[PDB]
Amino acid sequence: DNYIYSTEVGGVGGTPFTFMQESGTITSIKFNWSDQYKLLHHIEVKFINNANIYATGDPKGNHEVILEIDDDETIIGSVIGYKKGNDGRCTGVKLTTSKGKSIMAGYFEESLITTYTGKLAGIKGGAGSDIDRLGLIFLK
Amino acid sequence: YIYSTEVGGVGGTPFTFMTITSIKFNWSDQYKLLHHIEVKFINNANIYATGDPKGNHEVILEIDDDETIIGSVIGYKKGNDGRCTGVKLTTSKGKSIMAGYFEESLITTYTGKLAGIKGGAGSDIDRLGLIFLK
Amino acid sequence: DNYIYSTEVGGVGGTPFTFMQESGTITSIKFNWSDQYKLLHHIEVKFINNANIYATGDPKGNHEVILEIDDDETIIGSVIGYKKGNDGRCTGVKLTTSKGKSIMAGYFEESLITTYTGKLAGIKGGAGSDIDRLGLIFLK
Amino acid sequence: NYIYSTEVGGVGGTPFTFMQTITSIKFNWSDQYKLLHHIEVKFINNANIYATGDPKGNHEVILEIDDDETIIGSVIGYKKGNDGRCTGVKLTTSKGKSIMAGYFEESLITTYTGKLAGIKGGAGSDIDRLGLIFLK
Amino acid sequence: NYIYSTEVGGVGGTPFTFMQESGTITSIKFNWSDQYKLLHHIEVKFINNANIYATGDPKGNHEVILEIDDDETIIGSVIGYKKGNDGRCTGVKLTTSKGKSIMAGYFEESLITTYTGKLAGIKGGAGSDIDRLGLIFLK
Amino acid sequence: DNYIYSTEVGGVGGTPFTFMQESGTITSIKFNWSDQYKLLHHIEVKFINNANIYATGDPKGNHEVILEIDDDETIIGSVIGYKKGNDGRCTGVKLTTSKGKSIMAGYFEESLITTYTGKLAGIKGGAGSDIDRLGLIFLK
Amino acid sequence: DNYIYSTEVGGVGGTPFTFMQTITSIKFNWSDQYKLLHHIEVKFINNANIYATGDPKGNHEVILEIDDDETIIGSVIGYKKGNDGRCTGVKLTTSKGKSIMAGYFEESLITTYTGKLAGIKGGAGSDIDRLGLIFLK
Ligand SMILES: OC[C@H]1O[C@H](OC[C@H]2O[C@@H](O)[C@@H](O)[C@@H](O[C@H]3O[C@H](CO)[C@@H](O)[C@H](O)[C@@H]3O)[C@@H]2O)[C@@H](O)[C@@H](O)[C@@H]1O
Ligand SMILES: OC[C@H]1O[C@H](OC[C@H]2O[C@@H](O)[C@@H](O)[C@@H](O[C@H]3O[C@H](CO)[C@@H](O)[C@H](O)[C@@H]3O)[C@@H]2O)[C@@H](O)[C@@H](O)[C@@H]1O
Ligand SMILES: OC[C@H]1O[C@H](OC[C@H]2O[C@@H](O)[C@@H](O)[C@@H](O[C@H]3O[C@H](CO)[C@@H](O)[C@H](O)[C@@H]3O)[C@@H]2O)[C@@H](O)[C@@H](O)[C@@H]1O
Incomplete structure (x- = not known):
């Protein structure tokens, strides 16, 4: 690929997802979290x-x-x-x-990845009720 | 023109104002x-x-x-x-x-030359999006 | 005009004033205020x-x-x-x-304007007992 | 060839004018007054x-x-x-x-800037009034 | 073509060397405990x-x-x-x-401030703990 | 003199001292002081x-x-x-x-002098039990 | 010499030492007890x-x-x-x-000469009695 793949962090749960566009970069990203969980x-x-x-x-x-x-x-x-x-x-x-x-x-109470930097082109991971794992994707 | 996500509710009457030389925000401590x-x-x-x-x-x-x-x-x-x-x-x-107040959700918008605003208002500002020049 | 007029802010009371010289800028400005009011x-x-x-x-x-x-x-x-x-x-x-x-x-307890910037050339508003309204005037 | 900052304070005291640039300046003040x-x-x-x-x-x-x-x-x-x-x-x-x-409890002047060339005002017992004087 | 930082900590653990012919580190993970x-x-x-x-x-x-x-x-x-x-x-x-x-992890006893540069690999000794750690840099 | 003399500050007590070497500048200076006094x-x-x-x-x-x-x-x-x-x-x-x-x-509990700057070339004042008075001396 | 010698600070005790050959590594051992x-x-x-x-x-x-x-x-x-x-x-x-x-900074301090650290010199037995830095020019 012409992409850099950051380590997916979190667990093995959820349905997998990959969001990329053939010659496209992320113009908008939204994160929903809870104080409760x-x-x-x-x-x-x-x-x-x-x-x-x-x-x-x-x-x-x-x-x-x-x-x-x-x-x-x-x-x-x-x-x-x-x-x-x-x-x-x-x-x-x-x-x-x-x-x-x-x-x-959200919250930063256990483990941390400092990822690769660059032009955010996508995200991959798994999710169900929660975001189980997440990895960023960058252009090279 | 670049249209920033309109954030907030679906309530109130649509508006579209379309570069900005002056903008005024009115808010309450009550609500x-x-x-x-x-x-x-x-x-x-x-x-x-x-x-x-x-x-x-x-x-x-x-x-x-x-x-x-x-x-x-x-x-x-x-x-x-x-x-x-x-x-x-x-x-x-x-x-x-x-x-105003920043107690629940937040958008960090596109930047550039502020050229207009779109959203919905009635009693309150229900939804607001910025509009920029390229 | 070769002048920018900042919004006059405050009330409609007091006698109008405009301080501007034919080709001069402000070299000194003095503000009087009270803790009482x-x-x-x-x-x-x-x-x-x-x-x-x-x-x-x-x-x-x-x-x-x-x-x-x-x-x-x-x-x-x-x-x-x-x-x-x-x-x-x-x-x-x-x-x-x-x-x-x-x-x-003075005090900043209610409303605020962040005004145009530039070479302060004059002011304009209304006053009697108090400064009712104030607007700055700049060179271009 | 001088700039005169506003003399601030009262009308009291013997006038003074110190001009000849300033290489040293000393201020004496009290916690009492x-x-x-x-x-x-x-x-x-x-x-x-x-x-x-x-x-x-x-x-x-x-x-x-x-x-x-x-x-x-x-x-x-x-x-x-x-x-x-x-x-x-x-x-x-x-x-x-x-x-x-000293103290900054009532009124303030933010003066002109430049090469400090002298001072002027009045003083008897206290410094009644003080203006700075600058080169151009 | 390599600079070896002092290996710090004990003599225990199985030795290790992570380096690849003409290849630098792109990711490094450190697992540590609040217990030990x-x-x-x-x-x-x-x-x-x-x-x-x-x-x-x-x-x-x-x-x-x-x-x-x-x-x-x-x-x-x-x-x-x-x-x-x-x-x-x-x-x-x-x-x-x-x-x-x-x-x-923790910084409660001793500290090395190492050489700087392009981290090429690591060497030391580990078993159930990381006994000893040294960094390896390119020039 | 090819020297600048900073005001000597403090009292009239102690024995006068003047530390200058013709064509030499200070390479080391030690200050000894007391919490007691x-x-x-x-x-x-x-x-x-x-x-x-x-x-x-x-x-x-x-x-x-x-x-x-x-x-x-x-x-x-x-x-x-x-x-x-x-x-x-x-x-x-x-x-x-x-x-x-x-x-x-030492301590800064009464008066202060902000001195001339430059190459520190010598010191001058008076001392007995204490440093009664101290002025700095600079090159031009 | 082509070297700058910082003041040796501390006591007159210890066996004298001089380490010159620039320094690539220096290690300081100290105690909370003393x-x-x-x-x-x-x-x-x-x-x-x-x-x-x-x-x-x-x-x-x-x-x-x-x-x-x-x-x-x-x-x-x-x-x-x-x-x-x-x-x-x-x-x-x-x-x-x-x-x-x-270690500790409870009594006296020197702010030394700066530059390329080339060696050290002082005296030590049980403790570091005195320590001077040596710099290149
Ligand atoms: O005969 C005395 C006169 O006294 C009062 O009116 C004159 C002033 O009253 C002050 O309290 C104030 O209202 C002034 O108003 C001027 O200043 C205010 C504040 O900036 C401004 O809003 C106004 O537009 C005026 O410039 C008055 O001048 C009254 O008691 C009056 O009844 C009486 O005749
Ligand atoms: O009767 C007036 C005044 O009398 C007493 O003060 C008198 C003198 O006091 C001196 O210490 C000094 O204040 C003199 O005034 C000079 O100095 C002040 C301070 O700069 C200045 O204002 C004056 O202009 C003079 O230069 C006074 O004459 C006091 O009893 C006082 O309370 C009383 O009002
Ligand atoms: O027995 C001699 C002397 O003993 C006592 O004074 C000793 C010193 O006391 C210090 O506190 C101070 O007073 C010293 O004064 C000298 O040093 C100070 C500090 O720099 C300086 O200002 C003075 O000019 C002196 O050089 C004293 O030396 C007292 O019992 C005394 O009475 C007796 O002479």
Whole structure:
């Protein structure tokens, strides 16, 4: 591929998902989480030049954040909080862009990945009630 | 034109105001929402208003002809019964404003030259999206 | 005009005033205010190459601040505090210059304008006992 | 060839004018009265100390200014009105030197900046009124 | 063509060397415990190689992963340890040339501030714990 | 003189001292001070190209600091704390160099002098049991 | 010499030592019990010998490895003054934002000369009695 694949972190649960577009970058990402369970429950992605919302997980959470990404905007800093192991869950995400935009979703109470940086082109993982595992995908 | 996600509820009357030289946010401590927004444009003296100026606070941001939004955050209640609660804007000249409350959900929007606003208002600002120039 | 007019903020009361010189900018501005009423009461302005003092409002306040402005010195940051509505008043002013000078007069308890920036050339509003309304005027 | 910052404070005291640039300036103030009482000034190529006011205060600060050194930041605290007094001074220089004398409880002037060339005002027992004077 | 940072901690554990002919680290995982306050397990991935190299026993209740871009160097590196023959490696702080930083474990006894540069591999000794850890850099 | 003399600050007491070497600058300066009396007691000075330690005052203080100065290193900030008057004393010294080296000695509880900056070439004042008075001397 | 010698700070005790050949590694051993340095090890560029002095009796150590092009921009040694003096701590900061901190700073301080750390010199037996840094020009 012409892509970089960040480690999927979290557990083995959920239905798999992959969100990529043939020559497309993420223009919008949404994280839904709960104070009650301290996990991510639901993720939405929009891509450049495509009106479709791609969604996974159950939007059961009392909070959401959206990050909109300009066409020339990169991720210069990215951290995913998670519970490790087979019954693991994805708990939080901090993103920071080349234009000083940042977002913070969920909780960071067990494990952390500091991912590869670049132009966010997609996400892969598994989800059901919760976001079980999550990995970012970048352009090279 | 770049259209930023309209955030908040499906309630109130649609509006579309379409570069911005002045924007005013009216909010209340009682309901912790935006109620009223005014906009003035370059080379036009008409004031475009929406929602009800019920709130006990207002802020005005005046934008220079060559000034851009380098930072923009809208707080809101998600759901069909959603509301805009708050706006934070930061400009290319270190100017910044802060209206309302940021107690539930947040969007960090596209940046650029603020060229208009779309959404729905009645008693309150139900939904708000920014619009930028390319 | 070769002038930018910032929104006049506060109420409709008081006698209109406009302080502007045919080809001059403000070299000195003084704000009078009170802890008792938590409003601006009085403003004085001197201009480059003019020894007249232009005054408006009643100097009844227990506090004053003077900002002296060098000829090549601009405002880069400007905020006016006020009470909105017909019975509105101007409550405070924060100015910051291109040479790191700043001043702070009065109170910021209700409403705010972040104004246009530039070379402060004049002011315009209404005053009697109090500063009813205030708007800044800049060069282009 | 001089810029005159507003003289701030009262109408009281014997007038003074110190001009000849300032190489040294000393402020004397009291915690009892919360005012400046006394100021001394030395100038470049001149060993005379020019004083005004009564050095009754329990604190002093001296700022020595290098020959190429400017004031980039200057604030004088005062009581406004005819019975007015100069209550405090903050100076910051082009070399990151700063000083703080006295109190800032009532009124403030943020003065013009530049090469500090002299001072002017009135003083008897207290510093009644103080204006800075700058080169162009 | 390689710079060897001091191996810190004890003499115990099976030796290990993770390095690939003309290949730098792209991912490194540190597993540690609040119970024993040590590193227990390290995993490493290399550029153009899908094999995971692991050592120690993954019994810790915490992990951190640092992914390294191909042009990304280490500008700050601190390893926490207990000195002596019975020694252990207790913690790792890394900072990269792109403002990425990670923090694993505890810094309660001894500290090395290592050489900097392009992290090429790791060497030391591990069994149920990481006994000893040294970094390996390109020039 | 090809020297600049900073005001000597503190009292008229002790024995006069003047530490200068024709065509040599300070390479080391030691300050000794007391928590008990909150004053400087004793200073030493070494010069470039001279092994003689010049000392003054009584080294009775429980603390000392040494600043070594590289041949090309200037003082870019200098503050001396002191007690004003005939019975005055020198209580404290902060120095900062052109290479970001700083030292801090003693207490700053009464009066302050922010001195001239430049190449520290010598010191002057008076001392017996304590440092009564201290002035810095700079090159041009 | 083509070297700058920092003031040796501490007491007159100990066997004298001088380690010169630039430093690629320096290790400080110190105790919470006595709150002094006890032991220093140095390795040099292109030399496998470990040069050691004092007694490694302390419960803490710190190692600073120094890249070939890396200098000391900040340097503070903590000590007890007088003839029965000791060296109590070291703070070094490098041109690459690296810093280490060993032992205690409860009495006296030297802010030393800076530059490329080329060696050390002092006296030690049970403790580090005195410590001076050596720099290139
Ligand atoms: O004959 C005395 C006169 O006294 C009062 O009116 C005059 C002033 O009253 C003040 O309290 C105030 O209302 C002033 O109003 C001016 O200033 C206010 C505040 O800025 C402004 O809003 C107004 O527009 C005016 O500029 C009045 O001047 C009354 O008691 C009156 O009845 C009486 O005749
Ligand atoms: O009767 C007036 C005044 O009398 C007493 O003060 C008198 C003198 O006091 C001196 O200490 C000094 O204040 C003199 O005034 C000079 O100094 C002040 C301060 O700068 C200045 O305002 C004056 O202009 C003079 O230069 C006074 O004359 C006191 O009883 C006082 O309370 C009383 O009002
Ligand atoms: O027996 C001699 C002397 O003993 C006592 O004074 C000793 C010292 O006491 C110090 O506190 C101080 O007073 C000293 O004064 C000298 O040093 C100070 C500090 O620098 C200085 O200001 C003075 O100018 C002196 O040089 C004393 O030396 C007393 O019992 C005394 O009465 C007796 O002479």
